Design an enzyme around this catalytic site. Sequence first.
Site, short mmCIF file in Angstrom:
data_model
loop_
_atom_site.label_atom_id
_atom_site.label_comp_id
_atom_site.label_asym_id
_atom_site.label_seq_id
_atom_site.Cartn_x
_atom_site.Cartn_y
_atom_site.Cartn_z
N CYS A 108 0.81 -1.39 -0.07
CA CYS A 108 -0.01 0.06 0.05
C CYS A 108 0.86 1.37 -0.10
O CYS A 108 1.47 1.39 0.92
CB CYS A 108 -1.14 -0.06 1.12
N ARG A 111 0.05 4.76 2.55
CA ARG A 111 0.00 4.28 4.10
C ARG A 111 0.51 5.38 5.07
O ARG A 111 0.53 5.34 6.15
CB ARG A 111 1.15 3.12 4.48
N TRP A 280 -9.17 6.82 -0.71
CA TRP A 280 -9.42 7.63 -1.95
C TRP A 280 -8.53 7.35 -2.85
O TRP A 280 -7.37 6.44 -2.72
CB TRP A 280 -9.28 9.23 -1.59
N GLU A 285 -4.72 4.35 -10.59
CA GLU A 285 -6.00 3.16 -10.23
C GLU A 285 -6.87 2.89 -11.25
O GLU A 285 -7.41 1.85 -11.76
CB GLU A 285 -6.24 3.27 -8.79
C1 HEM Z 1 -6.40 6.87 1.77
C2 HEM Z 1 -5.69 6.68 0.55
C3 HEM Z 1 -5.19 5.42 -0.01
C4 HEM Z 1 -4.59 5.41 -1.12
C5 HEM Z 1 -4.05 6.46 -2.21
C6 HEM Z 1 -4.19 3.82 -1.47
C7 HEM Z 1 -3.53 3.34 -2.48
C8 HEM Z 1 -3.36 2.03 -2.67
C9 HEM Z 1 -3.00 1.47 -4.14
C10 HEM Z 1 -2.42 2.36 -5.39
C11 HEM Z 1 -2.67 0.18 -3.80
C12 HEM Z 1 -2.16 -0.65 -5.21
C13 HEM Z 1 -3.49 -1.76 -5.57
C14 HEM Z 1 -3.38 -1.82 -6.88
O1 HEM Z 1 -2.81 -0.86 -7.54
O2 HEM Z 1 -4.20 -2.56 -7.38
C15 HEM Z 1 -3.06 -0.25 -2.49
C16 HEM Z 1 -3.13 -1.55 -2.00
C17 HEM Z 1 -3.42 -1.61 -0.56
N1 HEM Z 1 -3.95 -0.97 0.06
FE1 HEM Z 1 -3.90 1.15 0.28
N2 HEM Z 1 -4.65 3.06 -0.38
C18 HEM Z 1 -5.01 3.93 0.55
C19 HEM Z 1 -5.83 3.72 1.72
C20 HEM Z 1 -5.88 2.39 2.43
C21 HEM Z 1 -6.87 2.03 3.62
C22 HEM Z 1 -7.62 2.95 4.37
C23 HEM Z 1 -6.46 0.58 3.40
C24 HEM Z 1 -6.90 -0.35 4.61
C25 HEM Z 1 -7.42 0.26 6.07
C26 HEM Z 1 -5.61 0.12 2.56
C27 HEM Z 1 -5.25 -0.92 2.49
C28 HEM Z 1 -4.47 -1.79 1.36
C29 HEM Z 1 -4.03 -3.13 1.20
C30 HEM Z 1 -4.26 -4.00 2.11
C31 HEM Z 1 -3.44 -3.11 -0.09
C32 HEM Z 1 -2.99 -4.30 -0.93
C33 HEM Z 1 -3.49 -5.51 -0.81
C34 HEM Z 1 -2.44 -6.52 -1.06
O3 HEM Z 1 -1.71 -6.82 -0.10
O4 HEM Z 1 -2.48 -7.35 -2.09
N3 HEM Z 1 -5.23 1.34 1.85
N4 HEM Z 1 -3.37 1.03 -1.86
C1 LIG Z 2 -8.33 1.38 0.54
C2 LIG Z 2 -7.82 1.38 -0.83
C3 LIG Z 2 -7.73 2.56 -1.61
C4 LIG Z 2 -7.20 2.51 -2.82
N1 LIG Z 2 -6.84 3.53 -3.28
N2 LIG Z 2 -6.76 1.44 -3.62
C5 LIG Z 2 -6.87 0.23 -2.69
C6 LIG Z 2 -6.62 -0.81 -3.57
C7 LIG Z 2 -6.71 -2.03 -2.84
C8 LIG Z 2 -6.40 -3.28 -3.45
C9 LIG Z 2 -5.73 -4.37 -2.84
C10 LIG Z 2 -5.47 -5.64 -3.61
C11 LIG Z 2 -5.89 -5.77 -4.91
C12 LIG Z 2 -6.56 -4.76 -5.53
C13 LIG Z 2 -6.94 -4.88 -6.93
N3 LIG Z 2 -8.08 -4.05 -7.32
C14 LIG Z 2 -6.57 -3.82 -4.92
C15 LIG Z 2 -7.09 -2.16 -1.43
C16 LIG Z 2 -7.58 -1.06 -0.82
C17 LIG Z 2 -7.41 0.29 -1.50
#
Ligand code: HEM
Ligand SMILES: Cc1cc(N)nc2cc(-c3cccc(CN)c3)ccc12
Lengths: 411, 409
Positions: A108, A111, A280, A285
């Site tokens: 993520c 974070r 957000w 994405e």
């Molecule tokens: C608030 C702004 C946030 C932004 C801009 C953000 C952005 C991202 C992005 C771009 C990814 C990559 C996923 C992809 O590209 O397919 C990701 C993964 C992830 N996000 Fe964040 N996120 C945010 C908040 C959060 C929150 C609030 C949570 C949970 C409480 C969270 C949990 C996760 C997890 C668990 C993953 C990866 C899952 C895995 O391990 O495969 N995110 N995030």
């Molecule tokens: C909370 C949050 C915000 C954000 N902006 N993006 C997120 C993306 C994921 C994500 C994790 C594993 C695989 C994928 C594939 N779609 C997406 C989880 C949470 C997110």
Amino acid sequence: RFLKVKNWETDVVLTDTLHLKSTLETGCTEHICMGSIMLPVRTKDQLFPLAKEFLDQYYSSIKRFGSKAHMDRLEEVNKEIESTSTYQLKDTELIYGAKHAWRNASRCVGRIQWSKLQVFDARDCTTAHGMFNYICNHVKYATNKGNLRSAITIFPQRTDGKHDFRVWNSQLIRYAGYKQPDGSTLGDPANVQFTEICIQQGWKAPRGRFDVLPLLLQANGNDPELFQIPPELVLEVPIRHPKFDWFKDLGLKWYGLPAVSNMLLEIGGLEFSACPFSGWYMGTEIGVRDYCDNSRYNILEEVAKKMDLDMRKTSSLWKDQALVEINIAVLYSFQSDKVTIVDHHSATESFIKHMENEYRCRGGCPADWVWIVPPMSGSITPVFHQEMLNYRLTPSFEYQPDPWNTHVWKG
Amino acid sequence: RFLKVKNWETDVVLTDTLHLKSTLETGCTEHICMGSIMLPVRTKDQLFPLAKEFLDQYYSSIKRFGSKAHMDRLEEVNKEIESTSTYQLKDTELIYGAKHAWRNASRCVGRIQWSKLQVFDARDCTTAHGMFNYICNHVKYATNKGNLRSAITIFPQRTDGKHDFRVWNSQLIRYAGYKQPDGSTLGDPANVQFTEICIQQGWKAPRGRFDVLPLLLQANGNDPELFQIPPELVLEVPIRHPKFDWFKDLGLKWYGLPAVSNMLLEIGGLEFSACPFSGWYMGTEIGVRDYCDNSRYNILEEVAKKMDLDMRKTSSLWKDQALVEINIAVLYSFQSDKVTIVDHHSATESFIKHMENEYRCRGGCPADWVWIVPPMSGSITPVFHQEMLNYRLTPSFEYQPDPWNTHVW
Ligand code: HEM
Ligand SMILES: Cc1cc(N)nc2cc(-c3cccc(CN)c3)ccc12
Ligand code: HEM
Ligand SMILES: Cc1cc(N)nc2cc(-c3cccc(CN)c3)ccc12
Ligand SMILES: C[C@H](O)[C@H](O)[C@H]1CNc2nc(N)[nH]c(=O)c2N1
Ligand SMILES: C[C@H](O)[C@H](O)[C@H]1CNc2nc(N)[nH]c(=O)c2N1
Ligand SMILES: [Zn+2]
């Protein structure tokens, strides 16, 4: 033992001692790296160590380690485990757990925000209708008229794995995907399989390219139920481009609230199989993956054509050109509508600062380079040149199988 | 443990069995993945198993495993080791080894051409002047009037680590980098230290922006020597845009021949510390990296300026937009001058096909996702959605300390 990472752009070196607190496994061995593999019924026997370890962390954080409050809690949890074969988290513990799961989410990039999570305790919920209500309130609170707030809603923990709570949707808000007889797809190709389930469960599908899917909600291991999120709660943004006036005419829109609902939250050995969380969007994405992936809306060609690009040879980089314009548009549309969004340059910059701060005050930051680097313009964002260590910490968010593959149907 | 890899764009699944042959180590453990870390003299007893392993795979490749020829060679090499404390590769083994070091280079997207390598045996070389001669012939052959050809030139193997042959340049051809008194950097900032070592060794710098660096060649562990590559052997491409006329006025060009010269080639335990190798550029190496990296030419802002893009907020994506134009130009210029180059879409598509082929006829293909994915437009290239397994096979190319850190001066 120390471990060091280097940023090759700025020559900054950081030292990771936190990786030693790593319990789980990576999938890697001394002879193989599984760094790019997407994905590489618990008894009292192994539960109290997982509990004690969580509680030790918890009471470490609040500077009460070894206090009587700490020892009594351990004792309390112990007796509850040997008696009830599980245990309950105090509110404080659950909030700590949820935040650190996010903090520990090595894939993520967002974070930096982890401490400011709004934690909604839905552990008293017992029915799908109750789930629907908790989720509406999440969506409304999180959306906040375009000014997005991080939130997570936590439903009851798994018990004997026969009474699971699950949100069957992969995200609270997503568009339908319909496979046409001619092989073409109307809507989001990502959601075709789920859409079909919904329709089968009795969803009346409008069959448009941007139909918001119904919530399919499973409470206490019971057959899941359909609910329509009230449209006034679903904030969407029409996609236009600041210079290209024909872009609006592509008829694109996207929802504002990314809210992921198929993962599993693990805290002190407890498994929360329904725990939807939202933040957000980073622009890419939507604009890179959602629209331009070959296995998604795939509007690259459409955009390229309207740009009158040389689509004959790939060496014209027409794909690259159209991709940038589409991402320009997504950002522009969202900003014009005061709907919270972050561009990939700002977000990677923020993460680097977060990561440094985390090395300094925590002893490390688990991070998955493969996932942290943006899906476009990689090397011109500062995380590309950043060495990262990936390792698993708890609390954590884990993947779990799609419920329709494991669910025993009542009927 | 016969692992699987999935392409998430196509659902293609490949089964990897080749990894079980892996000898060396990745730097990862069950507790930590180091897949994004840039950089994680042999005894009589270490050397013979290394030799046997190599010879076993050599004679397997030519379908004479367990043969008289095989056993003889094994015996012959064994005896030569026992007495001379090293051994010498047969020409045929030299070529196989080299070709397979490239085949096994898990970070290389260009490996579909792996078996068409031109090997130049420079093991008879004894002086820097001789090295210069071998290298000039390599460059002229590889360049081939813009129609590039893969080659490697292999100088004598390590002995006791006191008589190492080394090319001190990281690449045969690279532009100088000068530290201006006002603060910043003229030319190529990546080459600032080496440019100084050259001057500190007696080079007369023209102090232009695109000064081709001199060769600094080291034979038999002696003091290294400066040589200037004949300008007519250095093919360069002026960089213009097919659409933007003002682009040529930036005054940019790049050299056609990527020729990496600081790595170590290991075959059957033997260590070739000087083994310059070359092919042809993927466009992004020049345009995304060589031009736009902050610690390099960093011309992005200048380009975007001439494009009249809104450089006020990052969210206008002017960097991205400019980045794309710059790379359109590099490819346009090279193709216009008939100098070989591949775009990042074509090369990644080729690599998937190469992967296909290797799983089919070899049972696998070691690959480093972090380096195979192009530094721009990642997810719209096919390798992005391609799971890859990374492991270390031998023969191989390896990194080695920069000579000035080591050399008993
Ligand atoms: C608030 C702004 C946030 C932004 C801009 C953000 C952005 C991202 C992005 C771009 C990814 C990559 C996923 C992809 O590209 O397919 C990701 C993964 C992830 N996000 Fe964040 N996120 C945010 C908040 C959060 C929150 C609030 C949570 C949970 C409480 C969270 C949990 C996760 C997890 C668990 C993953 C990866 C899952 C895995 O391990 O495969 N995110 N995030
Ligand atoms: C909370 C949050 C915000 C954000 N902006 N993006 C997120 C993306 C994921 C994500 C994790 C594993 C695989 C994928 C594939 N779609 C997406 C989880 C949470 C997110
Ligand atoms: C013929 C066309 C070739 C292309 C298009 C190509 C492409 C590339 C690219 C893009 C990289 C990434 C390096 C960077 O981004 O800085 C790379 C790395 C590498 N290339 Fe290839 N290459 C080609 C030929 C060769 C040849 C002929 C050899 C040697 C015989 C070779 C050996 C390597 C090695 C060993 C690495 C990475 C070193 C490591 O493991 O750290 N390449 N290549
Ligand atoms: C032969 C060939 C052709 C090509 N087009 N690119 C190449 C890149 C490398 C390379 C490997 C590791 C590190 C670096 C950083 N300077 C560059 C080696 C050989 C190459
Ligand atoms: C920190 C990171 O490992 C480092 O910048 C790597 C990442 N991927 C790369 N990939 C390629 N092709 N070339 C590189 O120089 C790098 N640099
Ligand atoms: C095969 C590969 O691991 C897979 O496509 C990953 C690569 N990196 C990614 N990185 C992000 N941020 N999101 C993704 O979906 C992926 N997909
Ligand atoms: Zn690894």
